[PDB]
Amino acid sequence: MKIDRMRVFMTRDKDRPRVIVALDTDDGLTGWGECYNHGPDKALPPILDYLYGFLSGQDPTRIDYLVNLLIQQSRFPPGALGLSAISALDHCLWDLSAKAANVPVYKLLGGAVRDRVKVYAGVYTAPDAPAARDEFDRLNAEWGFTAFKLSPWRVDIHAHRWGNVVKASADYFRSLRETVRDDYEIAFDAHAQIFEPVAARQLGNALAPYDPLFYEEPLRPENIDMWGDLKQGLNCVLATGESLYNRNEFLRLLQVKGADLIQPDICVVGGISEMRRIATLAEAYFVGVAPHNPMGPLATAVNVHFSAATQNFRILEYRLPKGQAYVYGGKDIEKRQGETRYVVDPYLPKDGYLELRPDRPGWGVEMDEKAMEEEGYIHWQRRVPKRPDGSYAFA
Amino acid sequence: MKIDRMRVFMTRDKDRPRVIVALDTDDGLTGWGECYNHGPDKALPPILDYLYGFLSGQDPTRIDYLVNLLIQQSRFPPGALGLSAISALDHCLWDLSAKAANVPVYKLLGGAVRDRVKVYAGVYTAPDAPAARDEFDRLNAEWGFTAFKLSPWRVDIHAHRWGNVVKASADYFRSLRETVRDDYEIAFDAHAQIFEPVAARQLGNALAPYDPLFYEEPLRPENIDMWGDLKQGLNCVLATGESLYNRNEFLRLLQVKGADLIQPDICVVGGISEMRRIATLAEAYFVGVAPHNPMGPLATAVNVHFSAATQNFRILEYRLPKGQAYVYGGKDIEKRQGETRYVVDPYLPKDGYLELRPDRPGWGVEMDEKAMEEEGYIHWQRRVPKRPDGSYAFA
Amino acid sequence: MKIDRMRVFMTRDKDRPRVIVALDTDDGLTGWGECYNHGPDKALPPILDYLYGFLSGQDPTRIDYLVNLLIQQSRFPPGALGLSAISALDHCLWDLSAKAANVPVYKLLGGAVRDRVKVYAGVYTAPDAPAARDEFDRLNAEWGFTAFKLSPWRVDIHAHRWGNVVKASADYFRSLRETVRDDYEIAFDAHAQIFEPVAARQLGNALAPYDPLFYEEPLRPENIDMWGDLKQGLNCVLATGESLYNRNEFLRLLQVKGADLIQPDICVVGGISEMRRIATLAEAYFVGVAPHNPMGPLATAVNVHFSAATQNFRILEYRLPKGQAYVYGGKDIEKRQGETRYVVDPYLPKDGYLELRPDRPGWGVEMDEKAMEEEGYIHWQRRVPKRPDGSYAFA
Amino acid sequence: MKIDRMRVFMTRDKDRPRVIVALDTDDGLTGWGECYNHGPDKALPPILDYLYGFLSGQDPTRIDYLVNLLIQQSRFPPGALGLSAISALDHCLWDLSAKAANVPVYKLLGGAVRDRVKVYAGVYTAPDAPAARDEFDRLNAEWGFTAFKLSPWRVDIHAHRWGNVVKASADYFRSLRETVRDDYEIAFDAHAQIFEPVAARQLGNALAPYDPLFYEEPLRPENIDMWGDLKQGLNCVLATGESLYNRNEFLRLLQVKGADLIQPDICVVGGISEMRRIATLAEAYFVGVAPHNPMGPLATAVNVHFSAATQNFRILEYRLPKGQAYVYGGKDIEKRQGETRYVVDPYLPKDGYLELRPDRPGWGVEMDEKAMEEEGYIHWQRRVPKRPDGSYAFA
Ligand SMILES: [Cl-]
Ligand SMILES: [Cl-]
Ligand SMILES: [Cl-]
Ligand SMILES: [Cl-]
Ligand SMILES: [Cl-]
Ligand SMILES: [Cl-]
Ligand SMILES: [Cl-]
Ligand SMILES: [Cl-]
Ligand SMILES: [Cl-]
Ligand SMILES: [Cl-]
Ligand SMILES: [Cl-]
Ligand SMILES: [Cl-]
Ligand SMILES: [Cl-]
Ligand SMILES: [Cl-]
Ligand SMILES: [Cl-]
Ligand SMILES: [Cl-]
Ligand SMILES: [Cl-]
Ligand SMILES: [Cl-]
Ligand SMILES: [Cl-]
Ligand SMILES: [Cl-]
Ligand code: NA
Ligand code: NA
Ligand code: NA
Ligand code: NA
Structure with a gap:
């Protein structure tokens, strides 16, 4: 299967905002992930949009392959905001792969x-x-x-x-x-x-x-x-x-x-x-x-x-x-x-x-x-x- | 004087995007700064918006005081995107302080x-x-x-x-x-x-x-x-x-x-x-x-x-x-x-x-x-x- | 402006002697500094006289430029008396530069x-x-x-x-x-x-x-x-x-x-x-x-x-x-x-x-x-x- | 015998100044020493005058006793000028002691x-x-x-x-x-x-x-x-x-x-x-x-x-x-x-x-x-x- 959509939800966890991410595939599965709340969480959706360019059309069961690609595209060690976004995408990939394998x-x-x-x-x-x-x-x-x-x-x-x-x-x-x-x-x-x-x-x-x-x-x-x-x-x-x-x-x-x-x-x-x-x-x-x-x-x-x-x-x-x-x-x-x-x-x-x-x-x-x-x-x-x-x- | 406005410009440097930041004061001065282009630069304006909350109304000649406040609000070491935004704000503060002192x-x-x-x-x-x-x-x-x-x-x-x-x-x-x-x-x-x-x-x-x-x-x-x-x-x-x-x-x-x-x-x-x-x-x-x-x-x-x-x-x-x-x-x-x-x-x-x-x-x-x-x-x-x-x- | 005079005052701080230094400029400013009292403080004025040769006619707003010149002229790490004299001259330069910038x-x-x-x-x-x-x-x-x-x-x-x-x-x-x-x-x-x-x-x-x-x-x-x-x-x-x-x-x-x-x-x-x-x-x-x-x-x-x-x-x-x-x-x-x-x-x-x-x-x-x-x-x-x-x- | 006079000579060694020191005793001996030329050598005589206060009336054959006293009076490590003066006084003491013992x-x-x-x-x-x-x-x-x-x-x-x-x-x-x-x-x-x-x-x-x-x-x-x-x-x-x-x-x-x-x-x-x-x-x-x-x-x-x-x-x-x-x-x-x-x-x-x-x-x-x-x-x-x-x- 191939990743074919990302959906990003800006929601909250009591008094802290929370960005929740879904990755969907062309065989109807969805994986979910949660970003850390560093603070300026309105920065997360544009980071996610950029990172998604490297995931579109890819096989989500190649988890480390794709997560490492996200790291290497960044080149600089990402630290807070970049890694928060990568974390949620990693979660989505494990979830998709597990669902694919039931x-x-x-x-x-x-x-x-x-x-x-x-x-x-x-x-x-x-x-x-x-x-x-x-x-x-x-x-x-x-x-x-x-x-x-x-x-x-x-x-x-x-x-x-x-x-x-x-x-x-x-x-x-x-x-x-x-x-x-x-x-x-x-x-x-x-x-x-x-x-x-x-x-x-x-x-x-x-x-x-x-x-x-x-x-x-x-x-x-x-x-x-x-x-x-x-x-x-x-x-x-x-x-x-x-x-x-x-x-x-x-x-x-x-x-x-x-x-x-x-x-x-x-x-x-x-x-x-x-x-x-x-x-x-x-x-x-x-x-x-x-x-x-x-x-x-x-x-x-x-x-x-x-x-x-x-x-x-x-x-x-x-x-x-x-x-x-x-x-x-x-x-x-x-x-x-x-x-x-x-x-x-x-x-x-x-x-x-x-x-x-x-x-x-x-x-x-x-x-x-x-x-x-x-x-x-x-x-x-x-x-x-x-x-x-x-x-x-x-x- | 007091910081009273921030203006953020999304522009470019040939084939790479570039976020340029101005901080204005109530005595009509402006300081300028340049963010590094890590990649997902649409993330920078919302980071800047959040950081500006800590600068509004402050004395820009307290440069290290304010930059350290930005660092400490973050608490986690910021790494790429957060520090790029902080860098431009630091530049703005030095520029304002120098202009204030002529x-x-x-x-x-x-x-x-x-x-x-x-x-x-x-x-x-x-x-x-x-x-x-x-x-x-x-x-x-x-x-x-x-x-x-x-x-x-x-x-x-x-x-x-x-x-x-x-x-x-x-x-x-x-x-x-x-x-x-x-x-x-x-x-x-x-x-x-x-x-x-x-x-x-x-x-x-x-x-x-x-x-x-x-x-x-x-x-x-x-x-x-x-x-x-x-x-x-x-x-x-x-x-x-x-x-x-x-x-x-x-x-x-x-x-x-x-x-x-x-x-x-x-x-x-x-x-x-x-x-x-x-x-x-x-x-x-x-x-x-x-x-x-x-x-x-x-x-x-x-x-x-x-x-x-x-x-x-x-x-x-x-x-x-x-x-x-x-x-x-x-x-x-x-x-x-x-x-x-x-x-x-x-x-x-x-x-x-x-x-x-x-x-x-x-x-x-x-x-x-x-x-x-x-x-x-x-x-x-x-x-x-x-x-x-x-x-x-x-x- | 240019440094154009040094005045050295041998005074005291209760029971300890104290050498106080002024550097004057050609636009009528004066900066002040205080030497540590190591002991033989009558040695300080001749040290200051020698160091002043490197400051005469210089732009006092080039603070580190001039202080480092004093250090390098000395070549040997100065220790007590030499650095006491340099300290007061450093103070004078910061004071002049601050007064110049108001x-x-x-x-x-x-x-x-x-x-x-x-x-x-x-x-x-x-x-x-x-x-x-x-x-x-x-x-x-x-x-x-x-x-x-x-x-x-x-x-x-x-x-x-x-x-x-x-x-x-x-x-x-x-x-x-x-x-x-x-x-x-x-x-x-x-x-x-x-x-x-x-x-x-x-x-x-x-x-x-x-x-x-x-x-x-x-x-x-x-x-x-x-x-x-x-x-x-x-x-x-x-x-x-x-x-x-x-x-x-x-x-x-x-x-x-x-x-x-x-x-x-x-x-x-x-x-x-x-x-x-x-x-x-x-x-x-x-x-x-x-x-x-x-x-x-x-x-x-x-x-x-x-x-x-x-x-x-x-x-x-x-x-x-x-x-x-x-x-x-x-x-x-x-x-x-x-x-x-x-x-x-x-x-x-x-x-x-x-x-x-x-x-x-x-x-x-x-x-x-x-x-x-x-x-x-x-x-x-x-x-x-x-x-x-x-x-x-x-x- | 006892140290009873110091004589300080400001002279030169070709193009560099040189301070030469004599210590005299009450039994008619003299010991001699040479200060390094750090630069501001007019500072050396007042240093020597101060140090001599600790040598007056003392037994010059107690060489390390007296040199260490000079070091300890200083308390701070002396570095250039202070140690140059101490060096010449050390020389004088060895010279006196050797002459005393023939x-x-x-x-x-x-x-x-x-x-x-x-x-x-x-x-x-x-x-x-x-x-x-x-x-x-x-x-x-x-x-x-x-x-x-x-x-x-x-x-x-x-x-x-x-x-x-x-x-x-x-x-x-x-x-x-x-x-x-x-x-x-x-x-x-x-x-x-x-x-x-x-x-x-x-x-x-x-x-x-x-x-x-x-x-x-x-x-x-x-x-x-x-x-x-x-x-x-x-x-x-x-x-x-x-x-x-x-x-x-x-x-x-x-x-x-x-x-x-x-x-x-x-x-x-x-x-x-x-x-x-x-x-x-x-x-x-x-x-x-x-x-x-x-x-x-x-x-x-x-x-x-x-x-x-x-x-x-x-x-x-x-x-x-x-x-x-x-x-x-x-x-x-x-x-x-x-x-x-x-x-x-x-x-x-x-x-x-x-x-x-x-x-x-x-x-x-x-x-x-x-x-x-x-x-x-x-x-x-x-x-x-x-x-x-x-x-x-x-x-
Ligand atoms: Cl449960
Ligand atoms: Cl229990
Ligand atoms: Cl090749
Ligand atoms: Cl080959
Ligand atoms: Cl980042
Ligand atoms: Cl140019
Ligand atoms: Cl109290
Ligand atoms: Cl309390
Ligand atoms: Cl208490
Ligand atoms: Cl960050
Ligand atoms: Cl007061
Ligand atoms: Cl050339
Ligand atoms: Cl050459
Ligand atoms: Cl060459
Ligand atoms: Cl010295
Ligand atoms: Cl010979
Ligand atoms: Cl030979
Ligand atoms: Cl006791
Ligand atoms: Cl006891
Ligand atoms: Cl010294
Ligand atoms: Na490089
Ligand atoms: Na904790
Ligand atoms: Na040499
Ligand atoms: Na102390």
Whole structure:
């Protein structure tokens, strides 16, 4: 069969816009993909239009052939917007190829190496311990979650003495351990807020006695080598990688021993074609994979198949389709709610895992095209905090 | 003063599209910038629209403050499209600030450290030596050029035995030295065609006895460390960097001794704000700067000011406004011509140098807005070569 | 315009001599600079006389051109006295160029990236905790200081058992935390007193639990590599660099991971031209800048502009114009007072920050030339301590 | 005995000024020293006045005690001017101590390890081979020289194509080997002219087949680590170090394998106290010492004693007291002559060696104080070349 149409939908995932892509073939199949929301998502349709010129008329079962062509046409490493678009197109190709062969996507990835896919709940705030307990218990009752990710920050990190900032985080984690179920796993996302390796090490070592599931992305991404310096003398599990794009950025991170767990995003790195390369590198270095996934239900489905097939996958970031809107930080349980509607039958956890749908070819979800037409673009931007001197710090 | 409007022009530079940006202020000044042409340039206006939200109402003389805000809003390192847009906005801010202070831009960069700016002619093909001689001599008579850049490739590198490919390049360079003026400098751009460090070393060492001005970008960009391996045992000057984006990618290249000369592009890396950081790093490592510049006359003007102020600048890539259309490779002098019209009074070489315009504030060129309205978008894409087995190689 | 006169003033800053330099132009402008006080400051005027030969008749807006000429004429790296003189001349050139363009100096440095400049109070002694509290509170009430720098040494380090020396410092810091405001930041300057990396590590790790803002310059400067050894296994923030001169000494410090925060002095390294290079290197290595500044009000003004423009600047060392004379160490609040008078309108802190003067071109201070004529040279020398065996240790 | 007076003489050594220092004692002895001529030599007397405060009344036989006190009072590493002054004072102390003990200085340095001291003639220009032959033969007949140092540069290195610059140097060395005596040794001083390690390597390897005695100081001094990169793949003996100041700068050079032969200057590094430390480090690294010495006859005498006592000393740079004035480069035999008169009985070579004077205590030369009063200061400065674009390069 041959690719013969692309359809691009500008929709939304609660308060963030979301570009969803379909590739159709001349034998009546359609594959679907989800772009990461970097910000200026109105840039994605013209990128997709350009990339489609290289896919028109091609055999979609030549997945890596076509994805690599997209990379090479670009020539410059694409980074954010270009790779987001390539990621969705990669997804479409895997989906088409799986549907052509009448199999779930994981059968094109070496088969399922696990029966279900562990998730943690993206909570992202720093609620007082009793409120945290109540929210964790609610999520546990409904979906079986026993792992959760919070912000460690209990004060403005630029407006208080650093020792007091760190003590507030340590005291907070202690209070959580005194309050919530003893089996619950709690990760902390420091959200690339910290400039100095030594400061990131101090915070990690203050959290370490309370067993963080992982300590995520404390530093900025551009200097990879400094991550190896951070990790020397660090007593907790260090995770990073959402802000890294390709096999080579991850290779350097691994070479310098800059992480214990890596967190590529399948909507950021160029889809499964690149995600699998990255995970294979990590596997040889004895590093696990916890995919980054604050994206929507189609992205979640793509992650299910990748995760099911990857030996060194450990746990998947997860946001409920109906539930909390996007947030980072704050001493509450986020009040803003929303419902993401572009997937009819999203993967929902049962007993803390997403479950395979082995009798459905492709991703195993149905798209709601009417819902996508109903809800269009919404502007979204990050908050870049300021220091008291008026300078900008880091989002 | 405050930024109060952005105007975005979709125009062209011969056969490549070109997005030109103006930022206007409430005291009637305008600054101008040029985006790199990565490919899908219809993506640039929506990126610019989004970024402008962070510039509206701001003091344009806070250049690094605002450019860094654009970087931090993005959070993920932007790479190609995002940084191209940021680059043009950076240019606009320097131009506005210089016009506000009634000085040439170089006076905002520590002042001029040279009186004029050496250029080499971007020829880019591999013409037989007599034709090369004639073209070099024509360019020398008219503009004073004594330095030129060619392709080294005299055959399809994937369809002949490698030893014969390299011998053809060495024989070619020998024939040029037997034919053209003895003082002419000749650089070779291998155009990121070669996969293996050892192969790149073999070619460089075959060219070395004939004194290439530099041997440019032989390998792909993603693995930075392999460049240090290439350069060990390399007998000629190695240049690279057009495909690298920021201070940290260049820092690693420098740390591994991966180049003797670096070639960032001021329309790719985020403009002068980043270019200066990159050049400062190189300077401390005793590495020169030969800016990448296959872009148009506004980009050339930006480069004039950066180059004039930077001690370790050596030579600037240059394409005539009226002349050869874009090309890489081929055993001729490119027949396709064009005229780039969006600058009224472009910098033209005299005796092989671009000359400062010290009595003109800002970049020192006038934009032709009517010309920009007259010539709009044109589709352009790279050629990704195939091997005889049907696989895709590298553009 | 052209430089057409130099005027050199031998004056003083309380108990230390101070050479202040003016460069005048033929269009009636004057730029001002401040030399570091290394010791034999009567050597500075003849150095300045010699250097002026290279500046006479030149365009002062070619700042880096001229400063680099001074460096290259010297050929040998200048170190202390030569670079002190070059530093003041660099200051004069930035000041002239800013006045010529009618802007504050920070507009020549990429613009302001913050609205005001955080300072810490240079206290420098080791007063008992109640006296420290009272002094900190006085400084806080008057100027808004919330950050202070002390000596850690509570006994003669060469006349007591080392474990007892370190315990005395740790007990002291504990007593300060039990006594002073919980938000106050306290740095310790070990003043290059310690010979052995292991000893410096032991002291730093004894201070670390009480959150030193930074631990400054514990070792001697000549062996840069040993700083990387010190910092391995060090649990507090390490700062150094006042005794390092140029981009390359700082590059090595950064390469070996020898500091978390660097402290170049703008009167020592060759002024802003070199300071900016050094800060750019540190920025790429994710290292902050806390400029060294025990110098006077003109030096402070130069620092204001540099600090305002530099993203990775964090905090500025500050001594009041009217207040404590120079001191290091001792278990009191220094009794010796003085008043530095060569600046009419010095930058004074408000709420713990120095404030920009955006409507004043140049540094934004007026020099008191009559005051400079009134108070001339005073002899000053360091105290080099002895060990009980009669040997000399380190100042 | 106690030091009780210092006398400072501002005199000259042909066309360069020279500060000569005497320290007198209360038992009627005098020791003598020579400062390097960095440039602004009127700065030296006030430095000396300040340093003398630490020597007055002291026992001059405590040489390292006092020299280290001078270093520690300075605290900051002194670099050029400060160390030049310290160097002369160090010389004075060795001379006094040797005279007090009635021995030649070498008996205070572990004794003579050789009977005489090999010298090479500092010629410094690049004369055509027949003229070189004639000059070498004249110097050989008169003084027994069989080793000579030239400039390699036969054209302006910034105004010709680099391959042609290097070829001119190689052709030149070939012509010398075809013309001069087969046993003559010829060194080349590239005079810190070359920016790029790769370029320095290319030139060295072009000279290598003709056996340069050494290839001196091709690169700039500030980045020490790049010297290790240069030397990797270099086929000739590499010498450097005149521009390095202390045991630690030399330690790093040695650690990176940045030289085969080191060239500290005994008037630059702080005299014998530091020179011996530097030479001991080099000895353990299996690196020889060829002291830098374009200075005058007193400096030469100091070098005789150091060289006589140092096992890894190889050869000493030498300029005749009556003969060629200071020069670097040029395609002639320097026409400018002069006579240096401040030493009555300077060391002159016999059969290519300086000869010990074992029956004379101290340095073994008499100072001509009347000559020093007769000829005073003369202004001298370096030539910093320009490139054709108007930028400054390197002296
Ligand atoms: Cl992109
Ligand atoms: Cl459960
Ligand atoms: Cl807060
Ligand atoms: Cl489900
Ligand atoms: Cl992007
Ligand atoms: Cl010509
Ligand atoms: Cl072919
Ligand atoms: Cl073939
Ligand atoms: Cl030539
Ligand atoms: Cl022109
Ligand atoms: Cl100096
Ligand atoms: Cl307060
Ligand atoms: Cl004591
Ligand atoms: Cl004790
Ligand atoms: Cl606080
Ligand atoms: Cl004030
Ligand atoms: Cl000095
Ligand atoms: Cl002989
Ligand atoms: Cl010439
Ligand atoms: Cl003699
Ligand atoms: Na995250
Ligand atoms: Na290129
Ligand atoms: Na200090
Ligand atoms: Na020399």
